[PDB]
Design a protein around this ligand. Structure first.
Ligand SMILES: CC(=O)[C@]1(O)Cc2c(O)c3c(c(O)c2[C@@H](O[C@H]2C[C@H](N)[C@H](O)[C@H](C)O2)C1)C(=O)c1ccccc1C3=O
Length: 575
């Protein structure tokens, strides 16, 4: 028989092959950094120095023949293409009329972006996240933010994945007009300019390729030479651990919505929709797309954008067009892909979209039932309440009243139930609506007792400015604090108040607060009680479930309460 091939490990890239080429140690345009191949090119060098070399080689993976070719003398390169990622035991055989001889087996890795070559992720979850048996029909969602791996030190293996059905990855930008990004300062705008170099306007890109696929995480077993690293390789490994998890890219958000206002022109929708199809073929761990346009009709970060007449019909066409495209991917892959969107729930945001038309294309609407009041002005209120608080004036709740100047309210007050009932009354099915819960507070300073019109209720006071604090306290920007910061610096373990704060609860609104009467610091947030009230409300109305912004800011208490409030319930999944 021929001499047995001897595989040259170093001549064959130590047997690590990848369907995706990702630039490392540089930051450039997205199309220069990312290249995806439907088939990996596998080149393996072998030699047969003594004896006869034979005529033909065969390559086997786990005992099954996957390639064949000609022997070229004493040194041959087996060259072939292969579609399915994975880890395989490879043998190379050489054959002639006298028989065949085979190399020892050796492990070959074929990387792909579904994580098929990866072991299940090793988790490091805070043990305060508890175990539940929530019915699998109920949505339990959260947002994981790409920049959370910096100062916030919160990585994919920290997520309590057994307690989640959906992870929304915040946020994928659209190339084009993006002046709103300059509002976060730092390098965010400039990093987008880099990512969009050589990219057509209105196509998606990865904003931070260091966080997404270059950074080596030692807890994931990454090495500097591993072909896919970053949060994306950890999400691939997380999907190997929890295969029924849905991981969905969230496009837009508050700072990254400016390009959506040009989707009134179909040509820019077509560009965008094609880029999303390419994105989901490239990054196969993702299960759909979430569109967080804030907001049709305006009222978001860009003060000079928003068209109440035309943005709603653009949003609806976008959804129609994205569902056509996802149906093509389902035909191609045999997989199911979801289309979702996070939406404003003030009456003046809902009135700009005919959701009865849009929602026929969509699996879920993540209703943003939070940010109703906040440090952008000096008016206290409940930022994430179900119902109207004691602080509101007569006729403020339903908008029939007048304000303190005698001016008509323009619509119903900002509460979760006022927005859910506006959506239901126009025919959006309850089982497509997912109710938002806040894992953060918004707050003020200067709300001292002398400013209250009702002494029992600090939401009747007036602020002098935003809450101020440090990042160790969970205050990453003025006026906003992580829930785990409120728990460590204002509630304490018994939930009865520390550091001069007192806890209170508006039982009408279903909304908690902490208030330091000395500093006038007042913070509106969600807590165990108010999250249990949201789960009861969701069960009462047959909503799809609950989601939360943002998972790094919880200590486990808010996701635990999301599950606790849903116990016993089931829902009909949308078809
Ligand atoms: C209740 C409501 O309708 C709001 O639009 C909600 C809101 C908000 O959700 C966020 C922000 C807001 O400023 C506001 C407020 O808009 C501001 C700017 C508007 N153009 C308008 O002038 C309004 C009165 O206040 C009011 C943010 O600033 C913000 C910043 C960073 C991330 C998310 C956020 C973030 O999510």
């Amino acid at each position: 028989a021929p001499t047995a091939p001897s595989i040259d490990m170093y001549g064959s890239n130590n047997l690590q092959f990848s369907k995706i080429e990702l630039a490392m140690e540089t930051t450039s345009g997205y199309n220069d950094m990312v290249k995806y191949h439907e088939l990996a090119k596998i080149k393996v060098k072998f030699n047969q120095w003594s004896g006869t070399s034979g005529d033909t080689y065969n390559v086997y993976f786990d005992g099954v023949k996957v390639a064949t070719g000609a022997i070229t003398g004493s040194q041959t390169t087996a060259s072939f293409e292969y579609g399915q990622g994975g880890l395989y035991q490879m043998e190379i055989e050489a054959c002639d009329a006298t028989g065949c001889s085979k190399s020892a087996p050796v492990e070959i890795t074929i990387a792909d972006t579904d994580g098929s070559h990866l072991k299940p992720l090793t988790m490091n979850v805070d043990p305060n996240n508890k175990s539940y048996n929530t019915d699998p029909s109920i949505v339990m969602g959260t947002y994981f933010v790409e920049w959370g791996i910096y100062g916030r030190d919160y990585t994919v293996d920290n997520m309590p994945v057994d307690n989640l059905t959906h992870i929304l990855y915040g946020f994928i930008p659209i190339c084009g007009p993006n002046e709103s990004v300059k509002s976060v300062g730092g390098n965010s705008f400039n990093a987008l300019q880099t990512a969009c170099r050589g990219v057509n306007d209105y196509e998606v890109v990865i904003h931070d390729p260091w966080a997404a696929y270059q950074k080596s995480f030692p807890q994931a077993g990454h090495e500097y030479s591993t072909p896919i690293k970053g949060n994306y390789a950890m999400l691939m490994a997380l999907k190997q651990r929890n295969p029924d998890l849905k991981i969905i890219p969230s496009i837009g958000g508050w700072t990254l919505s400016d390009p959506f206002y040009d989707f009134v022109d179909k040509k820019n929708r077509d560009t965008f929709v094609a880029s999303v199809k390419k994105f989901l073929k490239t990054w196969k761990f993702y299960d759909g797309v979430d569109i967080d346009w804030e907001f049709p009709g305006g009222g978001g970060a860009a003060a000079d954008k928003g068209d109440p007449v035309n943005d709603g019909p653009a949003y609806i066409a976008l959804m129609r067009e994205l569902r056509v495209m996802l149906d093509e991917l389902e035909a191609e892959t045999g997989r199911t892909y979801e289309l979702t969107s996070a939406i404003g729930v003030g009456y003046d945001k809902i009135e700009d979209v005919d959701y009865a038309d849009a929602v026929q294309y969509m699996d879920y609407i993540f209703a943003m039932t939070y940010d109703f009041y906040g440090g952008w002005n000096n008016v206290p209120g409940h930022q994430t309440a179900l119902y109207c608080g004691s602080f509101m004036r007569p006729g403020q709740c339903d908008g029939g009243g007048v304000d303190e100047n005698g001016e008509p309210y323009k619509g119903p007050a900002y509460t979760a139930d006022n927005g859910i009932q506006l959506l239901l009354a126009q025919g959006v099915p309850a089982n497509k609506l997912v109710l938002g819960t806040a894992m953060y507070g918004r707050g003020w300073e200067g709300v001292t007792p002398d400013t209250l019109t009702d002494p029992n209720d600090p939401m009747t006071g007036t602020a002098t400015g935003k809450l101020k604090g440090s990042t160790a306290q969970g205050v990453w920007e003025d006026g906003v604090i992580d829930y785990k910061g409120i728990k460590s610096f204002m509630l304490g373990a018994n939930n009865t108040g520390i550091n001069g704060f007192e806890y209170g609860y508006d039982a009408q609104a279903e909304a908690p607060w902490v208030w330091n009467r000395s500093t006038g610091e007042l913070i509106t947030f969600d807590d165990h009680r108010s999250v249990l009230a949201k789960g009861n409300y969701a069960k009462s109305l047959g909503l799809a479930g609950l989601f939360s912004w943002e998972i790094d800011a919880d200590n486990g208490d808010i996701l635990n309460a999301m599950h606790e409030g849903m116990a016993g319930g089931v829902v009909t999944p949308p078809n």
